[PDB]
Structures are given as C-alpha cells and as structure tokens.
Design a protein around this ligand. Structure first.
Ligand SMILES: OC[C@H]1O[C@H](O[C@H]2[C@H](O)[C@@H](O)[C@@H](O)O[C@@H]2CO)[C@H](O)[C@@H](O)[C@@H]1O
Length: 496
C-alpha cells in the first residue's frame, strides 16, 4: 500500500472501467489518485497479502467472504453516519453486519437468472425436466439448449437447493455450523439431475465461464445461467436475449444464493479516511453507481434513490424474482469451507471422479464442523462477540458500564438477545472493578457449562489470552486442563 493514493481490487467480471471513471472524478476533486485492479483469485489473494499488512485499500466481493476476513482482523470497522445509513436498504446493511459490527459498505444485490436467446427459444422452459427434450430438438440444428459454468458451485447451487439442499441451517438468529444440508435427499436429487444431463451429453463437464459465455453470445446455445454483470457482453453481441425466472425442479423453484456486492476497507490501510470518502461520497451516489452500472450491470443496487430509477427494468425484475425464491448467503467464516466442499463435489460428480452419493458425503464432511462440540464453541464465540459490541455502544452512550444483572440491559443495542450458551448455562452481566464480564453458567447442575479440553483450547485460541476466567474476581484464567469444577465462566467484554 501507499499513503495518499487508493488502490481498489474488484473481480474481473464486474464493471471495473466504470469504477475507474468514478476514481478519476475522485482524483479530479481531491488530487488523490485511484487505481482499480482486477487480480485473479482475488478473494484468496486478499487474505494472504492483507494478513501481511499489504494489499488494496479497498476490496470488492460478495458479502459471504467478509465474515472470514473480519474474523482474521483484515477489515476496518465502518462507521457511517445515520443519515448515510438511511440512504441504503436496511437488508443490505444486514448482509454486511457481522456479530454486531458493520464490516463493509453494501453496493448491490445479485442473483442468477435464466438468460435465453429469443431467436432460438421464443418461450423459455418453466422446468429443468423439459431441458433434455429441448436439447434434442436444438441438436438437430447444430445448437444446444443450455451451457453454463460448471467449474464454480455458485452456478449449480440453485438446482441443488431446489428440492431441499441448504448450506447452514438458520435458527433463532444464528447459523449452526454443524447443521449442513449438502448431503440430504434434496441435494442428491439436484446433483443427480445435473450429472444425468452431463452423462446424456446435454452438457459437458469441462464447460467453464468463458466457454459458456462465448457459446451463448455467438448464438450457439439457447440458454445460459448468469448474473447481471453478463448482460453487457450480451448487449454488444447480436443476440436478442431475455432474462427470466430459473426453471423449477420437481415442481419447486430453483434457489440461487443471493449475494450483496460489498466494499471493505483494509485494516492496514493508511488511507481509511480517503477510502471512506470515496465510497460514501463518490461511489454510493446516483452518478457513481450509474457509471459502474453502465459498464457492467450491478443488479438491484443498495442505494434507494438509484434502485427506484432502475426498478422498471424487466431484467432487474427477473433478478429480484430469482433472489426472492433463493436465500441470502451467510457471511460466517465457515462459508469458505462450504464453497470448497461443494466445488469439489460438483466437479468430481460431473467428471465421474466420484459418484453423487460419495461426492456429497465427502462434501458434508468438508463443509460442516468436525464435531458438535466445535459448533458449540463457535456459537458461544458469536454470542460473546455480539454482546461485546452491544456493551461498547452502551458504554459510549451512557458513559457508564451496563448494570450487573440481566443481559436485557443491552437489549435495544442488539436485536436477537442471547438467552442461553450452547456449551451450557445462562448469560448474565457481571461488573467487577474496572471490567464488565459476561458470566456464563451459575454453578448448578441445570445451569452450568461443560467444556472438553478440545473446546477449551479452541476458546482460548479464538478469544485470546487473559479474557476467560473461572471465578468472579477475574484472578484465575481458563487453561487447558482446567476442571471447571464450579461450571461457570467469566469473559471480559470491556476493560479500562
Ligand atoms: O462459486 C463459488 C463462489 O460463489 C460466489 O461467487 C460468485 C460471486 O458472488 C458473483 O459476484 C460472481 O463473481 O460469480 C462468483 C462465482 O464465480 C461467492 O461469492 C464466492 O465466495 C464463492 O467462492
């Protein structure tokens, strides 16, 4: 990185030339140079070079990766003023909130749609099941029915989820990282259908993003599956295209994962204030978003005033319809493991390196926590982090620590207030000397924590040294072979 200039990373399928135009307008006004790059494997390179203390000032990606980035301390907390926050749709803010803290600026909502060539297929299929028969007719003309990227699980997920597959189960405001649905009957039905399409030579296992795009834009295939960013290149081509709802599978809608394109600020950037100025006052304005959108369509933008302006576009209506039937992606750190797991399953099943049953069995193992005890610890870490953030807001506003007692003191600073720890025990607040601590458990058989040594290690590693105590004056720290005889934990949320 370099002070006095901004470097921005964004994926190559997005409108980086339009973003560069916003950067030039920024440079005009402020003299600060903005350089937009689009590295390969962007989402993997960032966490290596950021952990280093380098990388871009600003990173763009869908929101699902950002929880991992935040957990690793790679991201600067973002603090938009209330009036700025009011300019963006609340559900897009929700996508970039991680344990009570905003960790990026939301930009736009994307979901996959069915894109079809109206000159080859005046009426698109309503069902996946009728696609083999379409392909047979089209083969007669030297064409094919459908081509889309089979190397990225994002594109095959809508079909996998249709009959019941899911990533992480959501319950009581939290994701369960043990409860993964990649291996149920629904996921198997979806992936089996895909593999049958390939076995019957309706599709090719080697088809990647570039191959599918070239084929559709040259008029060689009647349909593809892609997001709003792709519409630009279809515009430039001679194809008369429509954008519509994904086909149903076994009578149920396809369920694409919904992504919110987001911009995060590198925690090691010496340019955070410049980065904040650029994002809030240049990019996230009608003119800034128009420049990006004119280059490669964003989808349904997060900025209310501009979303209204574009809302009549039938292609955006179709995007929103598919997004409605799908699910918002979790942003939790375990998403990276989920995506690696499903990529491997889809590639191996498609190429014949694993049967469908074997591929998904392995995928469930790869995607889910190793065991329920680890999932319990992740849950308690989530609770702790959320309560901490809430207690910090309480302090800054009252210039007092919360009262020792119920967690309800922090109620209006959270929405989902934690009631009970998954490791056992209830939550209370416990003010001691200069510290506010989260008390877990109350020393009774019915209300107390149990921790294995494995769990104790994980907590210590994940939460850090001198934070977890086993007695109410915060003398004795939790340690590997602690008996936890009294079944109570004290975790410091704030110290002065
Ligand atoms: O395929 C796994 C991949 O899916 C998503 O990535 C999308 C991205 O959200 C879209 O904006 C577009 O760039 O296509 C990508 C897939 O090639 C997840 O966001 C990503 O984390 C995940 O690895």
């Amino acid at each position: 990185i370099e002070e006095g200039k901004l470097v921005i990373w964004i994926n190559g399928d997005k409108g980086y030339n339009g973003l560069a135009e916003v950067g030039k307008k920024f440079e005009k006004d402020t003299g600060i140079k903005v350089t937009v790059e689009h590295p390969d494997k962007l989402e993997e390179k960032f966490p290596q070079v950021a952990a280093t203390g380098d990388g871009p000032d600003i990173i763009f990606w869908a929101h699902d990766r950002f929880g991992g980035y935040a957990q690793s301390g790679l991201l600067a907390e973002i603090t938009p003023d209330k009036a700025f926050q009011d300019k963006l749709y609340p559900f897009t803010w929700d996508a970039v909130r991680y344990n009570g803290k905003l960790i990026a600026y939301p930009i736009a909502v994307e979901a996959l749609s069915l894109i079809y060539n109206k000159d080859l297929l005046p009426n698109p299929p309503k069902t996946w099941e009728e696609i083999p028969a379409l392909d047979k007719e089209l083969k007669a003309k030297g064409k094919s029915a459908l081509m889309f990227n089979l190397q990225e699980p994002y594109f095959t997920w809508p079909l996998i989820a249709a009959d019941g597959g899911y990533a992480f189960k959501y319950e009581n405001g939290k994701y369960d990282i043990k409860d993964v649905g990649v291996d149920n009957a629904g996921a198997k039905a979806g992936l089996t259908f895909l593999v049958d399409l390939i076995k019957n030579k309706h599709m090719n296992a080697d088809t990647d993003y570039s191959i599918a795009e070239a084929a559709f834009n040259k008029g060689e295939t009647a349909m593809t599956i892609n997001g709003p960013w792709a519409w630009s290149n279809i515009d430039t081509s001679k194809v008369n295209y429509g954008v519509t709802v994904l086909p149903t599978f076994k009578g149920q809608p396809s369920k694409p994962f919904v992504g919110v394109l987001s911009a995060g600020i590198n925690a090691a950037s010496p340019n955070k204030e410049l980065a904040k100025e650029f994002l809030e006052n240049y990019l996230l304005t009608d003119e800034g978003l128009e420049a990006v959108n004119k280059d490669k369509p964003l989808g349904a933008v997060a900025l209310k005033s501009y979303e209204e302006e574009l809302a009549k576009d039938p292609r955006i209506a179709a995007t929103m319809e598919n997004a409605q039937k799908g699910e918002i992606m979790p942003n939790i750190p375990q998403m990276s493991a989920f995506w690696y797991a499903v990529r491997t399953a889809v590639i191996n099943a498609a190429s014949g390196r694993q049967t469908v049953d074997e591929a998904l069995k392995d995928a469930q193992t790869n995607a889910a926590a190793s065991n329920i005890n680890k999932a319990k610890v992740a849950s308690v870490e989530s609770d702790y982090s959320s309560v901490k953030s809430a207690a910090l807001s309480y302090y800054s506003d009252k210039n007092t620590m919360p009262p020792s007692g119920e967690l309800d003191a922090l109620e209006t600073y959270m929405d989902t207030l934690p009631d009970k720890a998954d490791i056992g025990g209830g939550y209370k607040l416990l003010l001691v000397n200069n510290k506010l601590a989260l008390k877990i458990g109350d020393g009774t058989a019915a209300d107390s924590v149990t921790l294995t040594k494995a769990q104790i290690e994980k907590l210590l590693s994940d939460i850090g040294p001198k934070k977890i105590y086993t007695e109410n004056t915060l003398k004795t720290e939790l340690q590997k072979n602690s008996t936890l005889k009294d079944g109570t934990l004290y975790i410091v949320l704030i110290d002065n």
